[PDB]
RNA sequence: CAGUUGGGCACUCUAAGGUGACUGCCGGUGACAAACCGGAGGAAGGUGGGGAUGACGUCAAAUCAUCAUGCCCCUUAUGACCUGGGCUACACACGUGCUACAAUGGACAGAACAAAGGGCAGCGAAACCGCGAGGUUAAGCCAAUCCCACAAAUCUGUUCUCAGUUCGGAUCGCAGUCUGCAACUCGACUGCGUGAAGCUGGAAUCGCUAGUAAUCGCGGAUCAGCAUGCCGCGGUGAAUACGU
C-alpha cells in the first residue's frame, strides 16, 4: 500500500467489527493472510492458515502495522 | 500552397505485391485525370523474434523466424473527383492493404 | 597456414612518431584510447620537458637499451627439458621491449601511473632498472644455457 | 490436466490481474507468442507449414 | 555557384559524411563545429586530416563536412573518406598517387551479429572443465 | 569434494554408499591426491534385466569415465572400477614415458 | 573530541568529517553541513571557534548514535520481542531481508 | 528558437529492377592440365565479411510434461473446484554471470557522437508538483512526421593522493512511490543512515585472428509489476600467430 491505504482483510474486517464490536471473542481459525493487525482488532487470536492447521497468534500491541500473516511460520524448519 | 493530395499508401506482406500492385495502382492513376506520383519507397520495416528451437533441452540451439512487411507509397497530384471516387474499383492483389490516406 | 603478418599504425600526434605510435597502441587498456593518448602525451611532456632533452632520442635510448637480443625458447625430450637459446627477431625485439617497459613501468607505484611510468622509462634510460633489468634478466638466463642448448634450436 | 487446465484458463479470471496467457493450438503455458498468437511449438510447426506472411529466416 | 570543388558522400562503419570543399585557405570545421569544436583534440585529428594532407599535401581549399552517423571513427573516418573520394573529385589526376596512398574503399568494419548462443559474436559460450 | 553418489529408482542405502565408496577408494587409495568423483547408477529388471552405471572421475587434468550393464547391480560396480583401472593407469604411464634421448 | 561530534575528524575532509559519526553521513553531511556552508572548507580541521559550534547547534540538533542503536534495538529487538516474521531471520541465522539460502550467504551464514 | 517554411529532389536516404568479381587480365611457377606466387585496375581478389543451409550413421543420447499415439493402471479418485502455502528452504560443495579490490581511477560542471526496435486493451510531448522514484491533466502519434529518447564510454576545469579509503558496495533499519484482489513467506525503484568482504585471487581451467577480443551504453520477446539472464543494436578501439 502507498497512500490509501492499509488493506484490511474484509472478512477479517467483518469479524473484527463484530468480535471487536463487543464481547471480546475467543480465538478461532481465520484463513485470510492479506492485511496486518488493525487498530481496533487487537487482543484477539488469529489461528491463521499455517499451511496445515492453524497457529494461535497474539493480537498484541507491538506489531501495530505488521502483517497478521507475517506472525505465523510458513516453512517447517529448522534445520539440519 | 498545393491541395491536400489524394493518394492511398500500400502495405503488403511480401515485396512484390506492393511493387506490381503499386504498378497497376499507378494504372488507376493514369486515368481519372492526371498527376499520379511515382514510387515513394517506404522504410520497409521487419521484425526479428526467435524461439527455443528444441522440444525440451538444447537451449542454445535456437531458431529465429523473421517476417518483414513494407510496401511503397503513391500520392497523385491532379484531383479528378470522378477517378478519386472511382478508386473503389480495386481488384488486386490477394494480399495487399489499400487505404486512401488524404 | 603460413606467416600471416599484421598492419602497423600511422604517425603520432606530436610529432610524426611511429614506434611511439606503437607505444600508444600499447598505451591504452580496456579500449578507451583517449586516456592512453593522454597518459602517453603526458609521458612525452614529462620526459621531454622535465629531464631536459629530446623525445625521439630519449625513447630511442630507452628502447634502444631496452630492445633485447637473445631469449629463452623451451623444449625437451619430455621431462627435464633444456631451455634453448632463441634470439629475437626484429618485431619480436620491439614487441618484447614494449612488453618489458610497459608491464614493468606501469606497475611502479608513484603518484600516477603516467608520471610514474615516465619515471620508470627515465630510470630505464640509464641502461638498467626495471626494463633494462629485465633485458639483462632474459639476457642473462640465455647464455647461462648457451653452451648446451645452443646448437639444437 | 489439459481439459481443466486449458478450459479453466479459457474461463473468466478471478481478479483483473488473474488472466494469464495460454497456449494457442496446444494449451501450453510458458511463452505463447502474444503478437503471433501461437505457442513455441505451435509457432514453429504452424509457421513452417504456412500461417501468415512470412518466413523466416536468417537476416542479421 | 562557387568553384568546382569536392562533394563526395561516402560511408565508413555507418557514418557517411558530406564534405563540401570550396576554394579556400584550409578551414576544416564541418557542421558549424571546428575540428577543435566537434571532437577535440586529439592527435587523431591529424589522421582525420591526413587525406587532405596527401592530395599533393595539400591545397588547402575550404572544408564544409556534414557528417552524421557512427561515432568518433564513424564521423571522423567518414569525413576523411568523403573528402578523400570527393577530394578525388577535386583534382581529376589526384587518383594516380591518391589511389595508391590508401584514401578509399570505406572499410565497413561494423559489428558482427552474434549467433544463437554466443557471447558477443566472438565470445564463446562456456567451458565446464572437469 | 569426493564421493557423492545418487541413483534413480532405488534407495541411497549406506550399505550401497559405503559399498560403492570403499571400491572407489581403490583409486585414491593408489594415486597421489584428488578431490573429485560424482557417480550415477539406476535401472532394474523392468525390461531385459539391466542396471546402468556410469562413474565419472575428471581429476587428473583430463577426464575419464566408464559405463557397463548387468542385472546383478552390485557386480557392475566392480565392472566400473576395473574399467577405471586402465583409464587411470594409462593416464599415468602413457604420460610417464622415458624414451627421451638426444644424440645416441 | 571533536568540538562538534564524539570522535570527530581531525586533519581530514569536511564532508567526510561530517561523514564520521554513526548517523552523520555523506548526503546528510552535505545537506546540514551545506546549510552551515563548509564544502571542505577548510578541508582539514579549521572550521571555526564559532562555526564548529555552529555544527554544535546545526550539527547538534539532529541525531543519533544511541538513538540509532536504540531504534535498531527496538527493530531487531522490537520485532525480536514483538513477534515475528522479521525475528526468525532477525536472529535465526537464515536470510531475513530476502535472498537465496544456497546463495553467497555473506550476510549471516557464509562458509 | 526550431528543415520550421515558401521552396528545392543536387547530395544523403528509402526498396524494385539491374550492373559489378568471375583467377577476369598481365608477369611467371608448374608434366602443357589442375592449381599456386606477384602486380595493375577497381568500392571490393582469389570461396569479400556474415547469416540461413547440417551426408549416410553413432549415442536404445533428450522429449509419453508442447502435441499425438500401442499396452498396463486409476475412476463416488492418480479426476474435477476453491483458500493458504511451496516451487524462493540452507551446516555445506559447485555452475554461469554481475559489481568490486581502485589514480589510465572517484565525485561534479559543461560540451559532443549513434544505431536498432517497439508504441491503440498502447506510447506518452510540454506544463506544474514531488530531492527522489513518480503524480496530475493533456497536445500529438495508428506512426520514415509523434513518443519511448536523454545515449553511455569520450573531451575541457575543480578536487580527492595510495587507505578498507571521499574506493567499493552488500547486509540491515527507518521513510516514500508505482504495480496489482492483495507486495510479511515472495515485485522492483527512491530518500536518509549503515558501510561486510575485497588491495588483481592456488593447483588448474577458459574464449579470442580485427572492427575480433575486451569494453561503454540502447532497444525488444515474455509482461499489470518483475533482468545481473536471452535476443538483437550501435560507441571506444588493441596485441600476437616463431612454427607443428
UniProtKB/Swiss-Prot annotation, chain D:
<comment type="function">
    <text>Binds 16S rRNA, required for the assembly of 30S particles and may also be responsible for determining the conformation of the 16S rRNA at the A site.</text>
</comment>
<feature type="binding site">
    <location>
        <position position="23"/>
    </location>
    <ligand>
        <name>Zn(2+)</name>
    </ligand>
</feature>
<dbReference type="GO" id="GO:0008270">
    <property type="term" value="F:zinc ion binding"/>
</dbReference>
<dbReference type="GO" id="GO:0015935">
    <property type="term" value="C:small ribosomal subunit"/>
</dbReference>
<comment type="similarity">
    <text>Belongs to the universal ribosomal protein uS14 family. Zinc-binding uS14 subfamily.</text>
</comment>
<dbReference type="InterPro" id="IPR001209">
    <property type="entry name" value="Ribosomal_uS14"/>
</dbReference>
<dbReference type="GO" id="GO:0019843">
    <property type="term" value="F:rRNA binding"/>
</dbReference>
<dbReference type="GO" id="GO:0006412">
    <property type="term" value="P:translation"/>
</dbReference>
<keyword id="KW-0694">RNA-binding</keyword>
<feature type="binding site">
    <location>
        <position position="26"/>
    </location>
    <ligand>
        <name>Zn(2+)</name>
    </ligand>
</feature>
<keyword id="KW-0479">Metal-binding</keyword>
<feature type="binding site">
    <location>
        <position position="42"/>
    </location>
    <ligand>
        <name>Zn(2+)</name>
    </ligand>
</feature>
From Swiss-Prot, chain E:
<dbReference type="GO" id="GO:0006412">
    <property type="term" value="P:translation"/>
</dbReference>
<dbReference type="InterPro" id="IPR020568">
    <property type="entry name" value="Ribosomal_Su5_D2-typ_SF"/>
</dbReference>
<dbReference type="GO" id="GO:0022627">
    <property type="term" value="C:cytosolic small ribosomal subunit"/>
</dbReference>
<protein>
    <recommendedName>
        <fullName>Small ribosomal subunit protein uS9</fullName>
    </recommendedName>
</protein>
<dbReference type="InterPro" id="IPR020574">
    <property type="entry name" value="Ribosomal_uS9_CS"/>
</dbReference>
<dbReference type="InterPro" id="IPR014721">
    <property type="entry name" value="Ribsml_uS5_D2-typ_fold_subgr"/>
</dbReference>
<keyword id="KW-0689">Ribosomal protein</keyword>
<dbReference type="InterPro" id="IPR023035">
    <property type="entry name" value="Ribosomal_uS9_bac/plastid"/>
</dbReference>
<keyword id="KW-0687">Ribonucleoprotein</keyword>
<dbReference type="Pfam" id="PF00380">
    <property type="entry name" value="Ribosomal_S9"/>
</dbReference>
<dbReference type="InterPro" id="IPR000754">
    <property type="entry name" value="Ribosomal_uS9"/>
</dbReference>
<comment type="subunit">
    <text>Part of the 30S ribosomal subunit.</text>
</comment>
UniProtKB/Swiss-Prot annotation, chain F:
<dbReference type="GO" id="GO:0022627">
    <property type="term" value="C:cytosolic small ribosomal subunit"/>
</dbReference>
<protein>
    <recommendedName>
        <fullName>Ribosome hibernation promotion factor</fullName>
    </recommendedName>
</protein>
<comment type="function">
    <text>Required for dimerization of active 70S ribosomes into 100S ribosomes in stationary phase; 100S ribosomes are translationally inactive and sometimes present during exponential growth. May not be the only factor implicated. Might negatively regulate the activity of the sigma-54 factor (SigL).</text>
</comment>
<dbReference type="GO" id="GO:0043024">
    <property type="term" value="F:ribosomal small subunit binding"/>
</dbReference>
<comment type="similarity">
    <text>Belongs to the HPF/YfiA ribosome-associated protein family. Long HPF subfamily.</text>
</comment>
<dbReference type="GO" id="GO:0045900">
    <property type="term" value="P:negative regulation of translational elongation"/>
</dbReference>
<keyword id="KW-0810">Translation regulation</keyword>
<keyword id="KW-0346">Stress response</keyword>
<keyword id="KW-0963">Cytoplasm</keyword>
<comment type="subunit">
    <text>Interacts with 100S ribosomes. Not associated with 70S ribosome monomers, about 1 monomer per ribosome.</text>
</comment>
Swiss-Prot record, chain G:
<dbReference type="GO" id="GO:0003735">
    <property type="term" value="F:structural constituent of ribosome"/>
</dbReference>
<keyword id="KW-0687">Ribonucleoprotein</keyword>
<comment type="subunit">
    <text>Part of the 30S ribosomal subunit. Forms a loose heterodimer with protein S19. Forms two bridges to the 50S subunit in the 70S ribosome.</text>
</comment>
<dbReference type="GO" id="GO:0006412">
    <property type="term" value="P:translation"/>
</dbReference>
<dbReference type="GO" id="GO:0019843">
    <property type="term" value="F:rRNA binding"/>
</dbReference>
<keyword id="KW-0820">tRNA-binding</keyword>
<dbReference type="GO" id="GO:0015935">
    <property type="term" value="C:small ribosomal subunit"/>
</dbReference>
<dbReference type="InterPro" id="IPR018269">
    <property type="entry name" value="Ribosomal_uS13_CS"/>
</dbReference>
<protein>
    <recommendedName>
        <fullName>Small ribosomal subunit protein uS13</fullName>
    </recommendedName>
</protein>
<keyword id="KW-0689">Ribosomal protein</keyword>
<dbReference type="InterPro" id="IPR019980">
    <property type="entry name" value="Ribosomal_uS13_bac-type"/>
</dbReference>
<dbReference type="GO" id="GO:0000049">
    <property type="term" value="F:tRNA binding"/>
</dbReference>
Amino acid at each position: 500500500s502507498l497512500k490509501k491505504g492499509p488493506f484490511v482483510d474484509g472478512h477479517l474486517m467483518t469479524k473484527i467489527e463484530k468480535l471487536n464490536e463487543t464481547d471480546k471473542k475467543q480465538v478461532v481459525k481465520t484463513w485470510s493472510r492479506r492485511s496486518t493487525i488493525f487498530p481496533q482488532f487487537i487482543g484477539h487470536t488469529i489461528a491463521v492458515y499455517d499451511g496445515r492447521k492453524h497457529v494461535p497468534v497474539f493480537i498484541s500491541e507491538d506489531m501495530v502495522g505488521h502483517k497478521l500473516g507475517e506472525f505465523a511460520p510458513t516453512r517447517t524448519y529448522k534445520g539440519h | 500552397m498545393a491541395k491536400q493530395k489524394i493518394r492511398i499508401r500500400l502495405k503488403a506482406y511480401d515485396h512484390r505485391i506492393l511493387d506490381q500492385s503499386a504498378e497497376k495502382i499507378v494504372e488507376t492513376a493514369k486515368r481519372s485525370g492526371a498527376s499520379v506520383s511515382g514510387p515513394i519507397p517506404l522504410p520497409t520495416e521487419k521484425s526479428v523474434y526467435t524461439i527455443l528451437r528444441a522440444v525440451h533441452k538444447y537451449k542454445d540451439s535456437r531458431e529465429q523466424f523473421e517476417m518483414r512487411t513494407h510496401k511503397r507509397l503513391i500520392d497523385i497530384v491532379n484531383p479528378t473527383p470522378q477517378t478519386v471516387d472511382a478508386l473503389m474499383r480495386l481488384d488486386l492483389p490477394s494480399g495487399v492493404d489499400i487505404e486512401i490516406k488524404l | 597456414k603460413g606467416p600471416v603478418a599484421k598492419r602497423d599504425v600511422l604517425p603520432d600526434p606530436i610529432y610524426n612518431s611511429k614506434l611511439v605510435s606503437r607505444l600508444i597502441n600499447k598505451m591504452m587498456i580496456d579500449g578507451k584510447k583517449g586516456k592512453s593518448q593522454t597518459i602517453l602525451y603526458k609521458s612525452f611532456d614529462i620526459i621531454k620537458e622535465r629531464t631536459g632533452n629530446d623525445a625521439m632520442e630519449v625513447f630511442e635510448q630507452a628502447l634502444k637499451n631496452i630492445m633485447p637480443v637473445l631469449e629463452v625458447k623451451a623444449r625437451r625430450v619430455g621431462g627435464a627439458n633444456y631451455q634453448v637459446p632463441v634470439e629475437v627477431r626484429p618485431e619480436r625485439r620491439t614487441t618484447l621491449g614494449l612488453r618489458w617497459l610497459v608491464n614493468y613501468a606501469r606497475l611502479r607505484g608513484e603518484k600516477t601511473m603516467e608520471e610514474r611510468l615516465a619515471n620508470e622509462i627515465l630510470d630505464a634510460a640509464n641502461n638498467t632498472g626495471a626494463a633494462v633489468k629485465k633485458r639483462e634478466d632474459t639476457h642473462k638466463m640465455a647464455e647461462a644455457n648457451k653452451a648446451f642448448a645452443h646448437y639444437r634450436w | 490436466a489439459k481439459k481443466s487446465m486449458i478450459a479453466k484458463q479459457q474461463r473468466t479470471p478471478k481478479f483483473k490481474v488473474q488472466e494469464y496467457t495460454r497456449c494457442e493450438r496446444c494449451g501450453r503455458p510458458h511463452s505463447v507468442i502474444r503478437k503471433f498468437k501461437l505457442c513455441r511449438i505451435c509457432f514453429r510447426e504452424l509457421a513452417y507449414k504456412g500461417q501468415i506472411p512470412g518466413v523466416k529466416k536468417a537476416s542479421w | 555557384m562557387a568553384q568546382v570543388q569536392y562533394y563526395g558522400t561516402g560511408r565508413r562503419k555507418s557514418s557517411v559524411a558530406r564534405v563540401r570543399l570550396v576554394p579556400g585557405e584550409g578551414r576544416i570545421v564541418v557542421n558549424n563545429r571546428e575540428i577543435s569544436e566537434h571532437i577535440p583534440s586529439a592527435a587523431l585529428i591529424e589522421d582525420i586530416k591526413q587525406p587532405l594532407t596527401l592530395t599533393e599535401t595539400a591545397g588547402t581549399y575550404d572544408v564544409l563536412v556534414n557528417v552524421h552517423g557512427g561515432g568518433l571513427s564513424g564521423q571522423a573516418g567518414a569525413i576523411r573518406h568523403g573528402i578523400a573520394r570527393a577530394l578525388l573529385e577535386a583534382d581529376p589526376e589526384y587518383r594516380t598517387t591518391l589511389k595508391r596512398a590508401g584514401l578509399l574503399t570505406r572499410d565497413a568494419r561494423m559489428k558482427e551479429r552474434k549467433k544463437y548462443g554466443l557471447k558477443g559474436a566472438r565470445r564463446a559460450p562456456q567451458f565446464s572443465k572437469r | 569434494m569426493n564421493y557423492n553418489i545418487r541413483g534413480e529408482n532405488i534407495e541411497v542405502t549406506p550399505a550401497l554408499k559405503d559399498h560403492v565408496e570403499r571400491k572407489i577408494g581403490k583409486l585414491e587409495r593408489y594415486f597421489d591426491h584428488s578431490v573429485d568423483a560424482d557417480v550415477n547408477v539406476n535401472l532394474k529388471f523392468y525390461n531385459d534385466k539391466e542396471s546402468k552405471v556410469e562413474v565419472t572421475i575428471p581429476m587428473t587434468d583430463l577426464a575419464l569415465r566408464s559405463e557397463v550393464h548387468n542385472e546383478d547391480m552390485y557386480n557392475a560396480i566392480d565392472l566400473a572400477t576395473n574399467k577405471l583401472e586402465r583409464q587411470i593407469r594409462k593416464h599415468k604411464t602413457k604420460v610417464n614415458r622415458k624414451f627421451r634421448e638426444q644424440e645416441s | 573530541a571533536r568540538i562538534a561530534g564524539v570522535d570527530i575528524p581531525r586533519d581530514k575532509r569536511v564532508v567526510i568529517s561530517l561523514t564520521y559519526i554513526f548517523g552523520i553521513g555523506r548526503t546528510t553531511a552535505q545537506q546540514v553541513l551545506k546549510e552551515a556552508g563548509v564544502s571542505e572548507d577548510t578541508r582539514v580541521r579549521d572550521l571555526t571557534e564559532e562555526e564548529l559550534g555552529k555544527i554544535r547547534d546545526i550539527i547538534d540538533k539532529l541525531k543519533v548514535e544511541g538513538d540509532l542503536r536504540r531504534e535498531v534495538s527496538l527493530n531487531i529487538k522490537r520485532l525480536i520481542e514483538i513477534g515475528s516474521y522479521r525475528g526468525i531471520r532477525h536472529r535465526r541465522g537464515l536470510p531475513v531481508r530476502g535472498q537465496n539460502s544456497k546463495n553467497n550467504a555473506r550476510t549471516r551464514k557464509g562458509p
